[PDB]
Amino acid sequence: CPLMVKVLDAVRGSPAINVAMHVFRKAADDTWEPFASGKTSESGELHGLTTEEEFVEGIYKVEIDTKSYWKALGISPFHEHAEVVFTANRRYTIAALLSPYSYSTTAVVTNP
Amino acid sequence: CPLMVKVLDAVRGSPAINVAMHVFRKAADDTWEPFASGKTSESGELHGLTTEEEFVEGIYKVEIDTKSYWKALGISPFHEHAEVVFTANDSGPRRYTIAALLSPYSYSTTAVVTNP
Amino acid sequence: CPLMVKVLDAVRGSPAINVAMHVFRKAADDTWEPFASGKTSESGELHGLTTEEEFVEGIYKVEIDTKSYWKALGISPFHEHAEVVFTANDSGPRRYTIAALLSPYSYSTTAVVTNP
Amino acid sequence: CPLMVKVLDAVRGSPAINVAMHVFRKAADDTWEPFASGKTSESGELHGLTTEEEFVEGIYKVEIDTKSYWKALGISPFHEHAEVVFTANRRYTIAALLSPYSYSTTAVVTNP
Ligand SMILES: O=c1c(-c2ccc(O)cc2)coc2cc(O)cc(O)c12
Numbered sequence: 001c002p003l004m005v006k007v008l009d010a011v012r013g014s015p016a017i018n019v020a021m022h023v024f025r026k027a028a029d030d031t032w033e034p035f036a037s038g039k040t041s042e043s044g045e046l047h048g049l050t051t052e053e054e055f056v057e058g059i060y061k062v063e064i065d066t067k068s069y070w071k072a073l074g075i076s077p078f079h080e081h082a083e084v085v086f087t088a089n090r091r092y093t094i095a096a097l098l099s100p101y102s103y104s105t106t107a108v109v110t111n112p
Numbered sequence: 113c114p115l116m117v118k119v120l121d122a123v124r125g126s127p128a129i130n131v132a133m134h135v136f137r138k139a140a141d142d143t144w145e146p147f148a149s150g151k152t153s154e155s156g157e158l159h160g161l162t163t164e165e166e167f168v169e170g171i172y173k174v175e176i177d178t179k180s181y182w183k184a185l186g187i188s189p190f191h192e193h194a195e196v197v198f199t200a201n202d203s204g205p206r207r208y209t210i211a212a213l214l215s216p217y218s219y220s221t222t223a224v225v226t227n228p
Numbered sequence: 229c230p231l232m233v234k235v236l237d238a239v240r241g242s243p244a245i246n247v248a249m250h251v252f253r254k255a256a257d258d259t260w261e262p263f264a265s266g267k268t269s270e271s272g273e274l275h276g277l278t279t280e281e282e283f284v285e286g287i288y289k290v291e292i293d294t295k296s297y298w299k300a301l302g303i304s305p306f307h308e309h310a311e312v313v314f315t316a317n318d319s320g321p322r323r324y325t326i327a328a329l330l331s332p333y334s335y336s337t338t339a340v341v342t343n344p
Numbered sequence: 345c346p347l348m349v350k351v352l353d354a355v356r357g358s359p360a361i362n363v364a365m366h367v368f369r370k371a372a373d374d375t376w377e378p379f380a381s382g383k384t385s386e387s388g389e390l391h392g393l394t395t396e397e398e399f400v401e402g403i404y405k406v407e408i409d410t411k412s413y414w415k416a417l418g419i420s421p422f423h424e425h426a427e428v429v430f431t432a433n434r435r436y437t438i439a440a441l442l443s444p445y446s447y448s449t450t451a452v453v454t455n456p
Protein backbone atom coordinates (compact mmCIF):
# COMPACT_ATOMS: atom_id res chain seq x y z
CA CYS A 1 0.00 0.00 0.00
CA PRO A 2 1.92 3.04 -1.29
CA LEU A 3 -0.52 5.55 0.22
CA MET A 4 -2.70 5.53 3.35
CA VAL A 5 -4.64 8.35 5.01
CA LYS A 6 -5.54 8.40 8.70
CA VAL A 7 -7.93 10.97 10.18
CA LEU A 8 -8.47 11.71 13.88
CA ASP A 9 -11.10 13.75 15.72
CA ALA A 10 -9.63 16.03 18.42
CA VAL A 11 -13.07 16.97 19.83
CA ARG A 12 -14.38 13.42 20.45
CA GLY A 13 -10.97 11.72 20.84
CA SER A 14 -11.74 9.12 18.22
CA PRO A 15 -11.05 8.02 14.71
CA ALA A 16 -12.82 10.39 12.31
CA ILE A 17 -15.12 7.89 10.58
CA ASN A 18 -16.81 8.24 7.15
CA VAL A 19 -14.67 11.18 6.10
CA ALA A 20 -14.64 11.57 2.34
CA MET A 21 -11.53 12.56 0.42
CA HIS A 22 -10.38 12.82 -3.19
CA VAL A 23 -6.82 12.44 -4.46
CA PHE A 24 -5.66 14.48 -7.45
CA ARG A 25 -2.52 14.34 -9.56
CA LYS A 26 -1.13 17.53 -11.09
CA ALA A 27 -1.46 17.42 -14.89
CA ALA A 28 0.95 19.08 -17.38
CA ASP A 29 -1.50 21.99 -17.97
CA ASP A 30 -1.32 22.88 -14.22
CA THR A 31 -4.81 21.50 -13.46
CA TRP A 32 -5.75 18.82 -10.95
CA GLU A 33 -6.98 15.52 -12.36
CA PRO A 34 -8.90 13.11 -10.08
CA PHE A 35 -6.81 10.04 -9.36
CA ALA A 36 -8.58 8.22 -6.51
CA SER A 37 -10.96 8.62 -3.57
CA GLY A 38 -12.73 6.98 -0.66
CA LYS A 39 -14.06 7.36 2.86
CA THR A 40 -12.27 6.59 6.12
CA SER A 41 -13.21 3.32 7.86
CA GLU A 42 -14.27 2.86 11.49
CA SER A 43 -10.58 3.06 12.40
CA GLY A 44 -10.38 6.44 10.63
CA GLU A 45 -8.15 4.97 7.92
CA LEU A 46 -8.34 4.92 4.13
CA HIS A 47 -6.30 2.20 2.41
CA GLY A 48 -5.95 1.00 -1.19
CA LEU A 49 -6.17 4.36 -2.98
CA THR A 50 -3.44 3.32 -5.43
CA THR A 51 -0.80 0.69 -6.26
CA GLU A 52 2.97 0.96 -6.62
CA GLU A 53 2.83 0.76 -10.45
CA GLU A 54 0.21 3.52 -10.70
CA PHE A 55 1.71 5.75 -8.00
CA VAL A 56 4.41 7.40 -10.10
CA GLU A 57 6.40 10.56 -9.32
CA GLY A 58 4.32 13.72 -9.50
CA ILE A 59 2.57 16.34 -7.38
CA TYR A 60 -0.46 14.97 -5.54
CA LYS A 61 -3.30 16.61 -3.67
CA VAL A 62 -5.42 14.94 -1.01
CA GLU A 63 -8.55 16.97 -0.49
CA ILE A 64 -10.26 15.94 2.75
CA ASP A 65 -13.92 16.93 3.18
CA THR A 66 -13.64 18.09 6.78
CA LYS A 67 -16.61 20.48 6.45
CA SER A 68 -19.14 17.67 5.79
CA TYR A 69 -17.67 15.78 8.77
CA TRP A 70 -18.22 18.67 11.20
CA LYS A 71 -21.66 19.37 9.68
CA ALA A 72 -22.75 15.77 10.44
CA LEU A 73 -21.73 16.29 14.09
CA GLY A 74 -23.62 19.58 14.35
CA ILE A 75 -20.49 21.69 14.92
CA SER A 76 -19.63 24.85 12.94
CA PRO A 77 -16.29 24.36 11.13
CA PHE A 78 -13.89 27.04 9.90
CA HIS A 79 -12.31 25.33 6.90
CA GLU A 80 -13.94 24.29 3.63
CA HIS A 81 -11.68 21.23 3.57
CA ALA A 82 -8.17 20.12 4.50
CA GLU A 83 -5.79 19.96 1.54
CA VAL A 84 -2.48 18.02 1.57
CA VAL A 85 -0.24 18.78 -1.41
CA PHE A 86 3.09 17.02 -1.91
CA THR A 87 5.61 15.75 -4.42
CA ALA A 88 5.84 11.95 -4.36
CA ASN A 89 9.46 10.88 -5.00
CA ARG A 90 8.03 5.21 -0.80
CA ARG A 91 5.28 4.27 1.61
CA TYR A 92 3.22 7.37 2.57
CA THR A 93 0.97 7.70 5.58
CA ILE A 94 -0.77 11.07 5.72
CA ALA A 95 -2.27 11.72 9.12
CA ALA A 96 -4.75 14.52 9.73
CA LEU A 97 -5.86 15.69 13.14
CA LEU A 98 -9.12 17.61 13.02
CA SER A 99 -10.65 20.35 15.15
CA PRO A 100 -13.50 22.73 14.07
CA TYR A 101 -11.16 25.71 13.77
CA SER A 102 -7.83 23.95 13.34
CA TYR A 103 -6.18 21.03 11.63
CA SER A 104 -2.75 19.51 11.56
CA THR A 105 -1.30 17.17 9.00
CA THR A 106 1.83 15.06 9.13
CA ALA A 107 3.47 12.64 6.71
CA VAL A 108 5.14 9.45 7.90
CA VAL A 109 7.33 8.43 4.97
CA THR A 110 8.70 4.87 5.17
CA ASN A 111 11.14 2.84 3.06
CA PRO A 112 9.58 -0.59 2.27
CA CYS B 113 -7.18 44.88 9.52
CA PRO B 114 -9.67 42.07 8.75
CA LEU B 115 -7.16 39.43 7.62
CA MET B 116 -3.76 38.66 9.14
CA VAL B 117 -1.50 35.61 8.78
CA LYS B 118 1.08 34.53 11.38
CA VAL B 119 3.65 31.83 10.60
CA LEU B 120 5.98 30.08 13.06
CA ASP B 121 8.95 27.77 12.63
CA ALA B 122 8.69 24.71 14.92
CA VAL B 123 12.32 23.57 14.25
CA ARG B 124 14.06 26.85 15.18
CA GLY B 125 11.42 28.07 17.67
CA SER B 126 11.12 31.38 15.87
CA PRO B 127 8.89 33.45 13.65
CA ALA B 128 8.97 32.14 10.08
CA ILE B 129 10.35 35.21 8.29
CA ASN B 130 10.07 36.10 4.58
CA VAL B 131 7.41 33.45 3.93
CA ALA B 132 5.57 34.23 0.71
CA MET B 133 1.84 33.65 0.39
CA HIS B 134 -0.95 34.26 -2.12
CA VAL B 135 -4.62 34.83 -1.37
CA PHE B 136 -7.38 33.82 -3.81
CA ARG B 137 -11.16 34.33 -3.83
CA LYS B 138 -13.59 31.93 -5.51
CA ALA B 139 -15.43 33.69 -8.37
CA ALA B 140 -19.05 33.20 -9.50
CA ASP B 141 -17.85 30.75 -12.19
CA ASP B 142 -16.01 28.66 -9.53
CA THR B 143 -12.43 29.59 -10.53
CA TRP B 144 -9.83 30.93 -8.07
CA GLU B 145 -9.15 34.60 -8.68
CA PRO B 146 -6.03 36.41 -7.30
CA PHE B 147 -7.04 38.51 -4.29
CA ALA B 148 -3.85 39.56 -2.44
CA SER B 149 -0.30 38.48 -1.68
CA GLY B 150 2.71 39.28 0.48
CA LYS B 151 5.39 37.88 2.74
CA THR B 152 5.83 37.61 6.49
CA SER B 153 7.83 40.22 8.39
CA GLU B 154 10.57 39.73 11.01
CA SER B 155 7.79 38.85 13.49
CA GLY B 156 6.40 36.18 11.10
CA GLU B 157 3.27 38.26 10.50
CA LEU B 158 1.62 39.51 7.33
CA HIS B 159 -0.69 42.49 7.81
CA GLY B 160 -2.52 44.78 5.39
CA LEU B 161 -3.57 42.14 2.84
CA THR B 162 -7.06 43.65 2.47
CA THR B 163 -9.59 46.19 3.77
CA GLU B 164 -13.04 45.85 5.35
CA GLU B 165 -14.63 47.18 2.11
CA GLU B 166 -12.75 44.80 -0.24
CA PHE B 167 -13.00 41.73 2.03
CA VAL B 168 -16.59 40.79 1.16
CA GLU B 169 -18.39 37.43 1.70
CA GLY B 170 -16.94 34.50 -0.16
CA ILE B 171 -14.66 31.49 -0.14
CA TYR B 172 -11.00 32.41 0.28
CA LYS B 173 -7.81 30.42 -0.18
CA VAL B 174 -4.44 31.26 1.44
CA GLU B 175 -1.59 29.33 -0.18
CA ILE B 176 1.50 29.65 2.02
CA ASP B 177 4.79 28.87 0.23
CA THR B 178 6.29 26.65 2.94
CA LYS B 179 8.46 24.69 0.48
CA SER B 180 10.61 27.73 -0.50
CA TYR B 181 10.97 28.57 3.19
CA TRP B 182 12.33 25.09 4.09
CA LYS B 183 14.44 24.91 0.92
CA ALA B 184 16.23 28.21 1.74
CA LEU B 185 17.14 26.62 5.10
CA GLY B 186 18.61 23.55 3.33
CA ILE B 187 15.68 21.26 4.09
CA SER B 188 13.64 19.27 1.56
CA PRO B 189 10.13 19.33 3.09
CA PHE B 190 7.10 17.11 2.42
CA HIS B 191 4.48 19.72 1.54
CA GLU B 192 4.39 21.88 -1.60
CA HIS B 193 2.59 24.51 0.45
CA ALA B 194 0.20 24.97 3.35
CA GLU B 195 -3.30 25.87 2.18
CA VAL B 196 -6.15 27.41 4.18
CA VAL B 197 -9.57 27.47 2.50
CA PHE B 198 -12.52 29.05 4.29
CA THR B 199 -15.81 30.90 3.90
CA ALA B 200 -15.39 34.40 5.29
CA ASN B 201 -17.90 37.02 6.54
CA ASP B 202 -21.05 35.01 5.84
CA SER B 203 -22.68 36.26 9.08
CA GLY B 204 -21.27 39.79 8.68
CA PRO B 205 -17.72 41.19 8.91
CA ARG B 206 -15.17 39.42 11.12
CA ARG B 207 -11.45 39.80 11.79
CA TYR B 208 -9.47 36.68 10.84
CA THR B 209 -6.08 35.65 12.15
CA ILE B 210 -4.67 32.57 10.41
CA ALA B 211 -1.80 30.94 12.29
CA ALA B 212 0.43 28.33 10.72
CA LEU B 213 3.00 26.27 12.61
CA LEU B 214 5.61 24.73 10.29
CA SER B 215 7.76 21.60 10.47
CA PRO B 216 9.44 19.92 7.48
CA TYR B 217 6.95 17.00 7.44
CA SER B 218 3.99 18.56 9.25
CA TYR B 219 2.00 21.73 9.58
CA SER B 220 -0.81 22.95 11.76
CA THR B 221 -3.21 25.75 10.97
CA THR B 222 -5.65 27.54 13.25
CA ALA B 223 -8.06 30.45 12.85
CA VAL B 224 -8.85 33.05 15.48
CA VAL B 225 -12.08 34.75 14.47
CA THR B 226 -13.24 37.85 16.33
CA ASN B 227 -16.26 40.17 15.98
CA PRO B 228 -14.84 43.74 15.65
CA CYS C 229 8.68 40.86 29.43
CA PRO C 230 10.80 37.67 29.27
CA LEU C 231 7.98 35.13 29.62
CA MET C 232 4.54 35.26 28.00
CA VAL C 233 1.93 32.53 27.47
CA LYS C 234 -0.71 32.60 24.71
CA VAL C 235 -3.60 30.11 24.70
CA LEU C 236 -6.08 29.47 21.86
CA ASP C 237 -9.31 27.50 21.64
CA ALA C 238 -9.37 25.26 18.54
CA VAL C 239 -13.12 24.42 18.90
CA ARG C 240 -14.45 28.00 19.02
CA GLY C 241 -11.63 29.59 16.97
CA SER C 242 -10.98 32.15 19.67
CA PRO C 243 -8.56 33.18 22.36
CA ALA C 244 -8.85 30.88 25.38
CA ILE C 245 -9.90 33.42 28.03
CA ASN C 246 -9.58 33.12 31.83
CA VAL C 247 -7.26 30.10 31.61
CA ALA C 248 -5.41 29.66 34.89
CA MET C 249 -1.77 28.57 34.94
CA HIS C 250 1.02 28.07 37.47
CA VAL C 251 4.74 28.39 36.85
CA PHE C 252 7.32 26.37 38.83
CA ARG C 253 11.13 26.40 38.94
CA LYS C 254 13.23 23.34 39.79
CA ALA C 255 15.21 23.94 43.00
CA ALA C 256 18.72 22.70 43.87
CA ASP C 257 17.19 19.72 45.73
CA ASP C 258 15.17 18.75 42.60
CA THR C 259 11.70 19.77 43.89
CA TRP C 260 9.33 22.08 41.99
CA GLU C 261 9.08 25.45 43.69
CA PRO C 262 6.23 27.95 42.97
CA PHE C 263 7.54 30.72 40.70
CA ALA C 264 4.53 32.64 39.31
CA SER C 265 0.89 32.27 38.32
CA GLY C 266 -1.97 34.03 36.56
CA LYS C 267 -4.76 33.70 34.04
CA THR C 268 -5.15 34.62 30.38
CA SER C 269 -6.80 37.89 29.39
CA GLU C 270 -9.52 38.54 26.79
CA SER C 271 -6.82 38.11 24.11
CA GLY C 272 -5.80 34.71 25.56
CA GLU C 273 -2.46 36.12 26.71
CA LEU C 274 -0.73 36.17 30.07
CA HIS C 275 1.93 38.86 30.46
CA GLY C 276 3.96 40.09 33.43
CA LEU C 277 4.65 36.70 35.04
CA THR C 278 8.29 37.60 35.79
CA THR C 279 11.13 40.09 35.26
CA GLU C 280 14.54 39.83 33.58
CA GLU C 281 16.21 39.94 37.05
CA GLU C 282 14.03 37.20 38.61
CA PHE C 283 13.95 34.95 35.52
CA VAL C 284 17.38 33.36 36.01
CA GLU C 285 18.78 30.13 34.45
CA GLY C 286 16.96 26.97 35.38
CA ILE C 287 14.33 24.41 34.50
CA TYR C 288 10.82 25.83 34.45
CA LYS C 289 7.41 24.20 34.35
CA VAL C 290 4.20 25.87 33.12
CA GLU C 291 1.10 23.90 34.14
CA ILE C 292 -1.89 25.23 32.19
CA ASP C 293 -5.28 24.34 33.72
CA THR C 294 -6.98 23.23 30.50
CA LYS C 295 -9.41 20.90 32.31
CA SER C 296 -11.20 23.74 34.18
CA TYR C 297 -11.40 25.68 30.93
CA TRP C 298 -13.14 22.82 29.05
CA LYS C 299 -15.31 21.95 32.07
CA ALA C 300 -16.68 25.53 32.29
CA LEU C 301 -17.71 25.14 28.63
CA GLY C 302 -19.58 21.88 29.43
CA ILE C 303 -16.93 19.59 27.96
CA SER C 304 -15.18 16.70 29.75
CA PRO C 305 -11.66 16.80 28.24
CA PHE C 306 -8.93 14.14 28.16
CA HIS C 307 -6.04 16.04 29.74
CA GLU C 308 -5.74 17.13 33.38
CA HIS C 309 -3.61 20.02 32.17
CA ALA C 310 -1.13 21.04 29.50
CA GLU C 311 2.44 21.12 30.82
CA VAL C 312 5.48 22.84 29.32
CA VAL C 313 8.86 21.99 30.88
CA PHE C 314 12.01 23.67 29.59
CA THR C 315 15.48 24.91 30.45
CA ALA C 316 15.51 28.69 30.18
CA ASN C 317 18.34 31.25 29.72
CA ASP C 318 21.21 28.76 29.73
CA SER C 319 23.03 30.72 26.99
CA GLY C 320 22.05 34.11 28.45
CA PRO C 321 18.69 35.93 28.71
CA ARG C 322 16.00 35.22 26.12
CA ARG C 323 12.36 36.22 25.66
CA TYR C 324 10.00 33.21 25.67
CA THR C 325 6.54 33.03 24.18
CA ILE C 326 4.74 29.77 24.95
CA ALA C 327 1.73 29.13 22.72
CA ALA C 328 -0.83 26.45 23.47
CA LEU C 329 -3.59 25.37 21.10
CA LEU C 330 -6.39 23.53 22.90
CA SER C 331 -8.90 20.88 21.84
CA PRO C 332 -10.83 18.59 24.22
CA TYR C 333 -8.71 15.52 23.34
CA SER C 334 -5.55 17.18 22.02
CA TYR C 335 -3.18 20.05 22.62
CA SER C 336 -0.21 21.52 20.85
CA THR C 337 2.49 23.64 22.40
CA THR C 338 5.17 25.74 20.72
CA ALA C 339 7.89 28.08 21.92
CA VAL C 340 9.04 31.23 20.17
CA VAL C 341 12.43 32.16 21.59
CA THR C 342 13.98 35.51 20.71
CA ASN C 343 17.25 37.25 21.69
CA PRO C 344 16.26 40.70 23.10
CA CYS D 345 -3.96 -3.63 25.23
CA PRO D 346 -5.53 -0.91 27.40
CA LEU D 347 -2.78 1.63 26.67
CA MET D 348 -0.57 2.28 23.64
CA VAL D 349 1.73 5.22 22.86
CA LYS D 350 2.70 6.26 19.34
CA VAL D 351 5.40 8.86 18.65
CA LEU D 352 6.10 10.60 15.33
CA ASP D 353 8.98 12.76 14.14
CA ALA D 354 7.84 15.90 12.27
CA VAL D 355 11.40 16.81 11.14
CA ARG D 356 12.28 13.48 9.47
CA GLY D 357 8.70 12.39 8.65
CA SER D 358 9.12 9.05 10.36
CA PRO D 359 8.23 7.04 13.39
CA ALA D 360 10.23 8.36 16.36
CA ILE D 361 12.18 5.20 17.22
CA ASN D 362 13.83 4.31 20.56
CA VAL D 363 12.05 7.03 22.49
CA ALA D 364 11.99 6.28 26.19
CA MET D 365 8.99 7.02 28.37
CA HIS D 366 7.81 6.32 31.92
CA VAL D 367 4.21 6.00 33.08
CA PHE D 368 3.24 7.18 36.57
CA ARG D 369 0.07 6.79 38.59
CA LYS D 370 -0.96 9.52 41.03
CA ALA D 371 -0.71 8.25 44.62
CA ALA D 372 -2.95 9.36 47.54
CA ASP D 373 -0.19 11.65 48.92
CA ASP D 374 -0.19 13.63 45.61
CA THR D 375 3.12 12.13 44.41
CA TRP D 376 3.78 10.23 41.19
CA GLU D 377 4.59 6.55 41.53
CA PRO D 378 6.25 4.72 38.61
CA PHE D 379 3.82 2.27 37.04
CA ALA D 380 5.42 1.19 33.74
CA SER D 381 7.88 2.16 31.01
CA GLY D 382 9.49 1.27 27.71
CA LYS D 383 10.92 2.52 24.44
CA THR D 384 9.12 2.97 21.14
CA SER D 385 9.69 0.29 18.49
CA GLU D 386 10.75 0.81 14.87
CA SER D 387 7.13 1.72 14.12
CA GLY D 388 7.30 4.41 16.82
CA GLU D 389 4.87 2.48 19.01
CA LEU D 390 4.98 1.27 22.61
CA HIS D 391 2.59 -1.58 23.48
CA GLY D 392 2.05 -3.74 26.56
CA LEU D 393 2.63 -1.13 29.27
CA THR D 394 -0.25 -2.52 31.35
CA THR D 395 -3.20 -4.94 31.40
CA GLU D 396 -6.91 -4.34 31.89
CA GLU D 397 -6.87 -5.70 35.48
CA GLU D 398 -3.95 -3.46 36.50
CA PHE D 399 -5.12 -0.37 34.61
CA VAL D 400 -7.64 0.88 37.16
CA GLU D 401 -9.23 4.34 37.40
CA GLY D 402 -6.79 7.04 38.47
CA ILE D 403 -4.70 9.94 37.20
CA TYR D 404 -1.82 8.84 34.99
CA LYS D 405 1.22 10.61 33.64
CA VAL D 406 3.18 9.57 30.56
CA GLU D 407 6.54 11.27 30.61
CA ILE D 408 8.17 11.07 27.18
CA ASP D 409 11.93 11.70 27.00
CA THR D 410 11.85 13.90 23.91
CA LYS D 411 15.08 15.71 24.89
CA SER D 412 17.25 12.55 24.64
CA TYR D 413 15.62 11.83 21.26
CA TRP D 414 16.55 15.22 19.79
CA LYS D 415 20.03 15.02 21.38
CA ALA D 416 20.69 11.72 19.57
CA LEU D 417 19.80 13.41 16.26
CA GLY D 418 22.08 16.39 16.96
CA ILE D 419 19.23 18.92 17.10
CA SER D 420 18.72 21.43 19.96
CA PRO D 421 15.31 20.82 21.60
CA PHE D 422 13.23 23.28 23.61
CA HIS D 423 11.40 20.95 25.99
CA GLU D 424 12.84 18.80 28.77
CA HIS D 425 10.22 16.15 27.95
CA ALA D 426 6.63 15.79 26.80
CA GLU D 427 4.19 15.04 29.62
CA VAL D 428 0.67 13.61 29.07
CA VAL D 429 -1.51 13.70 32.18
CA PHE D 430 -5.04 12.29 32.20
CA THR D 431 -7.74 10.63 34.26
CA ALA D 432 -8.42 7.08 33.08
CA ASN D 433 -12.15 6.30 33.43
CA ARG D 434 -11.33 2.02 27.70
CA ARG D 435 -8.66 1.52 25.07
CA TYR D 436 -6.23 4.50 25.04
CA THR D 437 -3.91 5.45 22.22
CA ILE D 438 -1.78 8.47 23.07
CA ALA D 439 -0.15 9.92 19.99
CA ALA D 440 2.66 12.46 20.20
CA LEU D 441 3.96 14.46 17.28
CA LEU D 442 7.42 15.85 17.90
CA SER D 443 9.31 18.90 16.66
CA PRO D 444 12.40 20.49 18.35
CA TYR D 445 10.43 23.50 19.57
CA SER D 446 6.91 22.10 19.52
CA TYR D 447 4.89 19.02 20.31
CA SER D 448 1.30 17.97 19.98
CA THR D 449 -0.46 15.16 21.75
CA THR D 450 -3.82 13.57 21.05
CA ALA D 451 -5.78 10.75 22.67
CA VAL D 452 -7.79 8.29 20.61
CA VAL D 453 -10.15 6.71 23.14
CA THR D 454 -11.92 3.56 21.92
CA ASN D 455 -14.63 1.30 23.37
CA PRO D 456 -13.50 -2.37 23.06
O1 LIG E 1 1.73 29.81 18.23
C1 LIG E 1 0.71 30.40 17.87
C2 LIG E 1 -0.35 29.69 17.34
C3 LIG E 1 -0.32 28.31 17.19
C4 LIG E 1 -0.50 27.76 15.93
C5 LIG E 1 -0.47 26.38 15.76
C6 LIG E 1 -0.27 25.54 16.85
O2 LIG E 1 -0.24 24.19 16.68
C7 LIG E 1 -0.09 26.10 18.11
C8 LIG E 1 -0.12 27.48 18.29
C9 LIG E 1 -1.49 30.38 16.94
O3 LIG E 1 -1.61 31.73 17.04
C10 LIG E 1 -0.56 32.41 17.57
C11 LIG E 1 -0.69 33.79 17.69
C12 LIG E 1 0.34 34.51 18.23
O4 LIG E 1 0.23 35.87 18.34
C13 LIG E 1 1.51 33.91 18.65
C14 LIG E 1 1.64 32.53 18.53
O5 LIG E 1 2.79 31.93 18.96
C15 LIG E 1 0.60 31.78 17.99
Ligand SMILES: O=c1c(-c2ccc(O)cc2)coc2cc(O)cc(O)c12
Binds near residue numbers: 006008097104105441
Ligand atom coordinates in the same frame (compact mmCIF):
# COMPACT_ATOMS: atom_id res chain seq x y z
O1 LIG F 1 -2.45 10.82 15.95
C1 LIG F 1 -1.71 10.44 15.05
C2 LIG F 1 -0.90 11.34 14.38
C3 LIG F 1 -0.91 12.69 14.71
C4 LIG F 1 -1.41 13.60 13.79
C5 LIG F 1 -1.42 14.95 14.11
C6 LIG F 1 -0.94 15.39 15.33
O2 LIG F 1 -0.96 16.72 15.64
C7 LIG F 1 -0.45 14.47 16.24
C8 LIG F 1 -0.43 13.12 15.93
C9 LIG F 1 -0.05 10.91 13.37
O3 LIG F 1 0.02 9.61 12.98
C10 LIG F 1 -0.77 8.72 13.65
C11 LIG F 1 -0.68 7.39 13.28
C12 LIG F 1 -1.45 6.43 13.92
O4 LIG F 1 -1.35 5.13 13.54
C13 LIG F 1 -2.31 6.81 14.95
C14 LIG F 1 -2.40 8.14 15.33
O5 LIG F 1 -3.25 8.50 16.33
C15 LIG F 1 -1.63 9.10 14.68
